[PDB]
Amino acid sequence: MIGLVGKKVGMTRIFTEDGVSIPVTVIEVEANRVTQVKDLANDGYRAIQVTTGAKKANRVTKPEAGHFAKAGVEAGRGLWEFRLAEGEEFTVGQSISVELFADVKKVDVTGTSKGKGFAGTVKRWNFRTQDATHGNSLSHRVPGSIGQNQTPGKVFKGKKMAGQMGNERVTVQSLDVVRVDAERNLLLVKGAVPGATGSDLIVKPAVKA
Template identity: 35%
Template sequence: MEYIVEKIGMSRTITVPSQAVTLLRVLDAKVCEVNEGIAIVSYNSGKKMNKTIEGQQKKYSLSSEFNRFVTLEVANTEAGDLDLTPLADAEVLKTTFTTKGRGFAGVMKRWNFGGGPASHGHRMGRRTGSIGNAEWPGRVMKGKKMPGHYGNIKNSVKNEIVSFDAENNIIAVSGSVSGANGSLGRVKVAK
């Protein structure tokens, strides 16, 4: 079963020893159609609605608060509110979020290179250094660690569920989850 969640932030448990947890809020969603366990689900992304989505709203007669559509694997057998009962029994979740985008980054930030000496007139600084071979193969090898775009990619990780608050739809999972606070992602019941 899959759900759309918002990352609230990180906290820790009050047990001894303390454990780091990430808090995820399951978004209110409506199941519009169900075909063999795969459903069209509408949820509120907080963004403005466009004409295409307005047409979908009329088709499924939804209120204007639900402004995005996505296909998910759900427990529901018919249209209506999203069924959250599988989360109460779940032990492990597979969380998928987009990592924080850091733009164009150098090798020290992107690949944790050491850089050159900082003193005695060196021009090396934060540069890459030598990248190629002189004679053979006479080219830069594929996959060479160089400056470039860093972050803003999908990342999945498995986390154990520490607790699930059914009243507020908040899941506390052990460890960290990619992405900034307030970002939207998916969780799937893995176990």
């Protein structure tokens, strides 16, 4: 089934009547407007493309402005589309609310993780550091050996080395949905989700049922 696009809004905890406190991530899921519906006849697959939020009138380009005007949908920030499960249908211009998550229990949240920049092997791949004393010289956090000898004669592809860490989309799956608030457009999910505050997130029902 289709997901929804929301914005991460900090974190909080919910106190239950029995005493236990549930850490919850707050996701602001306002109305999602369908801008385009894809069908097997034309696109070879069925999907719905949705938009959310708002954009400055002078900031949206003409190609994007015409695309929204065709669907009669107010311009929003970015576009995302979700594949259909063959059991439901949608129409252009339809608005989708967070209420569809009322009957679900597990969700999958996808977002861009925080960017750590160029990271070393110790931080990136949990490499073990070498001794800080006992004669060690300029080799306290160095990766160490990266190959065997002449017989391979090369470093194998996929070697773990320092490089860019974070700033890629990652998915946290099977997260418990704690509360849904349609009128206030909130979705409380137990746990933590990728990305920093204000980052766009995609929420869909858990697939590992």
